[PDB]
Amino acid sequence: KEWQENKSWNAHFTEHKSQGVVVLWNENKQQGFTNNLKRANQAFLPASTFKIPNSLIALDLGVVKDEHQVFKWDGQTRDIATWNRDHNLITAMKYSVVPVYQEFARQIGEARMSKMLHAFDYGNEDISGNVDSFWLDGGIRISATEQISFLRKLYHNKLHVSERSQRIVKQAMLTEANGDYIIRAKTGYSTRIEPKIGWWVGWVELDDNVWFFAMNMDMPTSDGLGLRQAITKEVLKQEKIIP
Amino acid sequence: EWQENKSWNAHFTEHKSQGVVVLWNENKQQGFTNNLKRANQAFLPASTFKIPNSLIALDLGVVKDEHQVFKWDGQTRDIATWNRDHNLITAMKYSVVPVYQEFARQIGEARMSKMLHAFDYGNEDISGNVDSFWLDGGIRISATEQISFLRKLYHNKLHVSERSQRIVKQAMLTEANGDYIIRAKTGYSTRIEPKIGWWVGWVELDDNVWFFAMNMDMPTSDGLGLRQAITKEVLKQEKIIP
Ligand SMILES: *C(=O)[C@H]([C@@H](C)O)[C@H]1C[C@@H](SCC/N=C/N)C(C(=O)O)=N1
Ligand SMILES: *C(=O)[C@H]([C@@H](C)O)[C@H]1C[C@@H](SCC/N=C\N)C(C(=O)O)=N1
């Protein structure tokens, strides 16, 4: 009853002819739920979900002064139009602006990046590859359950970076809020290395509880990117976490 | 700097209401209102006072953080959401007066008076004890003075810790999606005429911030939804939100 398998959630994947895992962690009850215990512990490239620890490290080291500091567009036109403009940390997270985060990684450098991921206990802690692309096509690997462990430390300000760094990244993770819930989260789509997968990791703040979540799914084409959030919400709805 | 647009009066008249909306375009440093006179008239702050109260409680360590639980005193009050344990996030969301009265008592009148003066928040001539003055009319503030105060909080320029300001801005979170974030606080004042509703806060866009402060006559609790509805009709008219 610590970690419970609910195979009924597979219907939310099979409805879309898809396969994946959703992991939930009920913070008040200290109980975890997943449709697939094995896939819940399978490690993948973090892709854009790495923007969480990258943001934290950049802030703690003063590579990023605050969430208002402007990162000037380098004038190279890329396939994603929202990237071809100046950004701050809020918009860089919202639009997953890779080039901004690659520049952070170069200024952090390999020695500080490696040490800080070890201090974070982050996935396999392995930065092997390019200092500015290892989370896209390098050695780093993290499971859904390891995303939850990391996110629980961030939520509680327990990572070995400044409280201020943690509050700024949690602000930048803000995705959705209304009168029922707040979602702080980060999407990712890993396409450089097989298998192509989509992530959504974060948490749902309720009045008197927090539900952490980490989901990934097979994403052979960009068609189904909306399924990351739609399937997670169908699970949260089934479990009565959100109306 | 401050422009009167009487066309926004229609957003009030359509609902047989009277009030003021003030907008502040942060990038352009320009303000807009339907009524310059009312924009500068001071009203009881009611629950909008929970912003400075929260800041002072955090800065002094009366509130440790936004997770600290304030236990229900077991007395049933007529707002059901009050009758339960709260933290700073839910105390703000549900405007839990008794929690804020206890903060005020621990802050004490000397520290409360000094901190409100440093904030430039409301009239300097405050009558009433520390747990009642903001409820009973010892303090008043205008829509334009709400904007000035909110702009200082947004920029972490108030004379409290940066941390205190970030925690209150987190607690002000009201609505967010892919188009905008609203950080704001509702108020409803019924102790002294005119009974009024407030909504003060801001709209964070990708590339700008629009500060807002609205109050309106609220003769019954039936109209409380109009505080947000009228503000959003104005934000929609000005193309600030879709
Ligand atoms: C992060 O995981 C991604 C980065 C590494 O490219 C971004 C890219 C988008 S998918 C939209 C790209 N269009 C494809 N045709 C993304 C996401 O939606 O999660 N994260
Ligand atoms: C803030 O403006 C408060 C919320 C609930 O609207 C409001 C509560 C009252 S005291 C309790 C009144 N009793 C029944 N509702 C209050 C005030 O007096 O300033 N503000």
Automatic annotation (TrEMBL), chain A:
Q: Which residues carry this modification: N6-acetyllysine?
A: 51
What EC number(s) does the entry state?
A: 3.5.2.6
Q: Which residues form a coiled coil?
A: none
> Tell me, which GO biological process terms does this entry list?
antibiotic catabolic process; cell wall organization; response to antibiotic
Which Gene Ontology terms cover its molecular function?
beta-lactamase activity; penicillin binding
Q: Which UniProt keywords apply?
A: Antibiotic resistance, Hydrolase, Plasmid, Signal
Q: Taking every annotated instance into account, which residue ranges of this chain make up the domain Penicillin-binding protein transpeptidase? A: 26-237
A GO cellular component annotation in the UniProt record: plasma membrane
Entry-linked InterPro entries: Beta-lactam/transpept, Beta-lactam/transpept-like, Beta-lactam_class-D_AS, OXA-48-like, PCN-bd_Tpept
The keyword Transport appears for this protein = no
List modified residues, type N6-carboxylysine.
51
Q: Which residues form the active site?
A: 48
Provide the reaction this enzyme catalyses. Answer: a beta-lactam + H2O = a substituted beta-amino acid
Instruction: Give the protein family.
Output: Belongs to the class-D beta-lactamase family.
Q: Which NCBIfam families does this chain map to?
A: bla_class_D_main, blaOXA-48_like
- According to UniProt, the name of this protein is Beta-lactamase
Q: Which gene encodes it?
A: blaOXA
From TrEMBL, chain B:
Does the record bear Transit peptide in its keywords?
A: no
What are the GO BP annotations of this UniProt entry? antibiotic catabolic process; cell wall organization; response to antibiotic
Cellular component (GO) terms are:
plasma membrane
Signal sequence annotation:
none
Q: Which Gene3D superfamilies does this chain map to? A: DD-peptidase/beta-lactamase superfamily
Report the sequence similarity comment from the record: Belongs to the class-D beta-lactamase family.
Give the protein's recorded name: Beta-lactamase
Q: Which organism is it from?
A: Klebsiella pneumoniae
Its taxonomic path starts at: Bacteria, Pseudomonadati, Pseudomonadota, Gammaproteobacteria, Enterobacterales
